[PDB]
Amino acid sequence: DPAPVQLIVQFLEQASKPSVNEQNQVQPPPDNKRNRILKLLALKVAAHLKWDLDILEKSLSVPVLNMLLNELLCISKVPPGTKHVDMDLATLPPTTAMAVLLYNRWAIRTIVQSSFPVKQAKPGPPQLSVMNQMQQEKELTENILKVLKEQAADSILVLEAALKLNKDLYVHTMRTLDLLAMEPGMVNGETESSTAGLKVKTEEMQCQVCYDLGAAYFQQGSTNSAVYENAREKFFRTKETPYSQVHIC
Amino acid sequence: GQTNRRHTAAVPGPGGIWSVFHAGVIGRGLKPPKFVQSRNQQEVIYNTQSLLSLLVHCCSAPGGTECGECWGAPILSPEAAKAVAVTLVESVCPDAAGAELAWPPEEHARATVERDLRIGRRFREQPLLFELLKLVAAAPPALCYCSVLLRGLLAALLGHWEASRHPDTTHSPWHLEASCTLVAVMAEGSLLPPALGNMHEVFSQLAPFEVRLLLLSVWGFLREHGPLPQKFIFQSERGRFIRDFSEGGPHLAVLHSVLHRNIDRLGLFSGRF
Amino acid sequence: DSLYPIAVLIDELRNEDVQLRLNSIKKLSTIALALGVERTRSELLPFLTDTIYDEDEVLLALAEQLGTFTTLVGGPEYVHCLLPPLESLATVEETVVRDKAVESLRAISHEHSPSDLEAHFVPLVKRLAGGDWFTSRTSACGLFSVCYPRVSSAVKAELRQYFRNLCSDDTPMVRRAAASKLGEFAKVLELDNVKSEIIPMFSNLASDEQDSVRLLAVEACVNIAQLLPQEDLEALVMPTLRQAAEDKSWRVRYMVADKFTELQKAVGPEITKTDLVPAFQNLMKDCEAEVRAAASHKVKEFCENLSADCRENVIMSQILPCIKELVSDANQHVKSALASVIMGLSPILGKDNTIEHLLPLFLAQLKDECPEVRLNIISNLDCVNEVIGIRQLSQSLLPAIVELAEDAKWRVRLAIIEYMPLLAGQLGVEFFDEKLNSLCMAWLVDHVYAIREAATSNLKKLVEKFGKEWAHATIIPKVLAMSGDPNYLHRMTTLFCINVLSEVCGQDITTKHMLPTVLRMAGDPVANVRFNVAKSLQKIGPILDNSTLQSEVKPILEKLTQDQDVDVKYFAQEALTVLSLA
Amino acid sequence: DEKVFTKELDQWIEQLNECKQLSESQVKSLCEKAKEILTKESNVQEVRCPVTVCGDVHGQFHDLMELFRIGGKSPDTNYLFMGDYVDRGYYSVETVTLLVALKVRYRERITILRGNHESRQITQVYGFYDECLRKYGNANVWKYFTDLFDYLPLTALVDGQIFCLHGGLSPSIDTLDHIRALDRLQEVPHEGPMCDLLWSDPDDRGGWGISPRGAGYTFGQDISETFNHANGLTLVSRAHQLVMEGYNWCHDRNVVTIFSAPNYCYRCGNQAAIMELDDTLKYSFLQFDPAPR
Ligand SMILES: [Mn+2]
Ligand SMILES: [Mn+2]
């Protein structure tokens, strides 16, 4: 249990990411019964295992809404930030800015995912596992509804984080700005059913992200794909040379 | 479109001292006819064209007064199209257990699955029915009476898409064609906004569960805004029945979410609506 | 944190599922090796001593895990602290956990030092054999033989007298365990110890008013008879087994009928000559069929260990009447047992003794009413082929092969088909074309597949034994004429026959006589015949020359490889790629 | 790629034919391949004569080998199993493993249907889950088998006339078009058309009636005649009840119960039978007894 982190860092063959998930689940289950020295000994290991990969996409399959929420809450223990995220352009340590941008990206991703037609798994029985799954789904829906009412400042925080570049790293700042622009474009693309005159900002952010990925996206991978170009083409077609099918419309 | 001599020359189990090897036959076996419909492809649609032309000549009210300036188009009589829809409903499904114009809820479709399946089989055996729907969808208030056929076809398509394991829609060509045709018919019959006209267009490369959810949203919208003989007031300009929508919030939201989940392939279809 | 293991063990073990419990039992070893030796010797063991669970799988898990703590507590110098947990888990309500506990204790008792043994393990069993529940007494009696040679003679006498006192109980719920332990406990006892005190105990246990105790008393008896020498059998153990073999119950009689070969091989031949004859005869003339079947099953190997001075006499004078009276019995179990066991005494009696009385009983058990005895009398007919002349056994089975060749069951038919090739070559050729040809032609069209393949192999053996040109006009045309039926089974049978005869009939006949049939049976719409034809072509490939394989086999294989099925296509492609034809 | 996998399949079959189970990865790959294979099959598998239809095996590998020795080898003749080969048996994993191996190796030469025991709530209370936990140590092979059982077809149509299915008729089903329009990729519920198709039983009742098992209905002769006349069928094959001769005719030769599990639960001591249908739709009932061990 103690040498699990070193074993995962040495080789990702056995228990690559399931060990950290199990540790976080055990720490969350033990946190209800007055966890004195049980949750503190597992939250640090979970944060270390999450920072060893330093990604958000690969840490989304199993931790759908609650596990990743607890992981982010444990990782954000450095900066309290009781009020709204503001004044991020000042001199701040890099780990705090990283935590805030990761939290904003996670919130945007959950807000976008909570409105998908993704097919659900069919059920034809009733037992304790079904009740547990129903309770987990209800808790996830409640958390998503609570986070949706506070997502008004998330876009402003992402814009402020993408505008500033005082992270003492040009490549890291450019990657963070590109990620924030992609998240803002994805969030604005799903806000077309609310009101009009909003696709302009989405198209601008998409063009900025495309230019960034063309010049220099980041050092890592799994950050951009043809989805960005497709969203840019969709925003250009919605805004209105031309194509054969587009000329008629 | 749509005795003992041979049994004696090979008997006695080739031993002439024991019984037969088998123990009898069940029925007949090896059905002789086994015929398939392969009459012709060409010159078959022209018979349908002639029949539709006869029906148009029959329903169109006279007619021949040079309306407009040079593009006078005669309208279709509502009574003739209503009678056509009535006889079509009577020929396809003579049942009347759920022949009400009010669309029942979705779960209600889980009890009359046999009627929906027989309607789907009748539609797949004779494509002319679809063409007949194209005659009923011309008159606005005519399609409101032929609602049982549309409900049964939609329920059959939903039941087929719920039990479809293929990740691509092209694996079932007839079902996709029937879905697009049904949505186009119920949209051009002054019952659905053009968003549904774009939905049946983008059906070409959609996932099966996505198509099922879109058809379920269609069912919900038709349940809310039911096709009824009222709300089709007459216009003093021409004999056309204009439907003024007083549209679907959650339906448009579901459509937008389906379109956004597949931006990597349906990007150009977003700018159309 | 030193309290973290306790905090994670006090809650994870209390749950609703048992998989986590088994995982925790598996990880106790890692927890102990990570906590250190002092931390598991200080408070971990007293903490795990008083854990009384409710289910039983965790009990078996902890019982099998405690036996793997040899080098994780401190070694033989620190085995005195693992005693409280074992003595607490030994006194429970379940049974299998008690067996696991006694196995673990017997396994870990080898690495114990003799001084530590005599100092600590003796008080353990002394306090365990005096408990209130029967579980304690049943678990104490099994920890005496392993610690006997290491302790001194005083402790030996103490444990012996304590065992003698504890086996004087009134209810057999502990006497059963005591009797089961007498089997493995008497291995280390000397002669005087078993002559002085074990004989009275055995005589008191043999005279018990219960029947379940004799089940194990007979095992103790055969054990002490095998262990003791010859000079202490004819006056000590004989009366007990004699009075036990004629008890009012049939269980002890069945047990002594089963465990009789060890007795007759340990007491020697003379003791079996004096008084074992009546003891063996009274077990064959009872009303229960179990004892008779057991005696019949055991007499075969009982005769094997009999000297050649009075074997034939006692067989022709005493064994023969019992055999004759047991063969004509109405019960089917004893008849089947006799039919399955008596075909092993033929080499013992000799050649001139089978035709005397073995042939009548064999023919009687062969043509019987129930198939159970026939399945046994026909499955052991190969061991009488060497001791009896082939002509004699072929002539004796003539009035029976006219009916046993075609009956309801197929095992008898299988045995007849397997034994036929040893008879068709001796009865000449006229007998073959008289009845055996019809018999084989009827076997080739049987319903089941085992009889069909057996007849195929028999026809192969016959065509290898008789000749090639002989079957060219007698068997080949009749087999080839069967390939015209609407049934696919007969066609597959003919294909299998062509495959099995292509390697014996040379290559000249298989070129224009059997080859055109396989070539014309390729347009069969049945998908289960085309792959068989392809496999037949593959098999006859190396047999035929390259000219025939290149002239007509290659085009027909190319034509067969262009169909819609996948199995026949794969078989044809494999046949093409194995014969290097493409 | 294909030849090496075929040879591996033959080796797996030869290993299973000697009372030897496979490993975890081998069973996982076999279940995956069976999932990709059975996805193309519909609910009513169109089987073509000639065939050799069997009944319940209830996890009896020795009885399965006896059946193979009686009714021809598996690659030679066609086979049609109607479920119940996973529960109530000492060797249950070996039987289903051999069956699924023959299915993935001879997809056009053998067909297997789904029974009432091929589920997740029945295998846990009859010993199959216990056998998977004891033999393989963990409980992953059982999970793979229960996930694969959802892909097994429901019924089978032999020559367009014979209708083979485990349970029997259904009150909510009037034609085969309803059976073809069912989502078989679902756990067997306690009520519905699939539950009745997998839990029905024939009797001389007439009409319908609740079954003493707890699930499914009980039809009579008139219902069987109506179902056979409204679908062009001439016979309904089933395997859900324990018989003695092996085959039983009911409802004026309209329903055929074929129990191919000899010595059911090792306590009845009955026989077993299979029905071999030739090319001309001629039936032959081949009977057998439990092979000695
Ligand atoms: Mn069953
Ligand atoms: Mn069943």
Short mmCIF file of C-alpha atoms in Angstrom, two decimals, chain C residues 2 57 97 150-151 192 250 321 327 385 402 447 451 459 491 496 526 558 567:
data_model
loop_
_atom_site.label_atom_id
_atom_site.label_comp_id
_atom_site.label_asym_id
_atom_site.label_seq_id
_atom_site.Cartn_x
_atom_site.Cartn_y
_atom_site.Cartn_z
CA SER C 2 1.51 2.45 13.38
CA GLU C 57 -15.13 -19.14 4.73
CA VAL C 97 -12.13 -25.88 9.72
CA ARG C 150 10.75 -36.75 20.08
CA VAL C 151 9.50 -36.89 23.70
CA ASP C 192 5.06 -54.30 24.06
CA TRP C 250 -24.05 -55.69 7.28
CA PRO C 321 -19.87 -74.06 -5.77
CA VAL C 327 -23.88 -66.75 -11.18
CA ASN C 385 -7.49 -64.83 -25.81
CA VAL C 402 -25.81 -64.64 -34.16
CA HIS C 447 -27.37 -45.33 -36.27
CA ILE C 451 -20.23 -48.55 -34.14
CA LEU C 459 -13.00 -53.73 -42.25
CA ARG C 491 -22.31 -40.85 -47.80
CA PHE C 496 -14.60 -42.71 -44.43
CA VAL C 526 -24.73 -30.76 -48.80
CA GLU C 558 -9.65 -25.23 -58.00
CA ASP C 567 -15.34 -24.48 -43.96
#
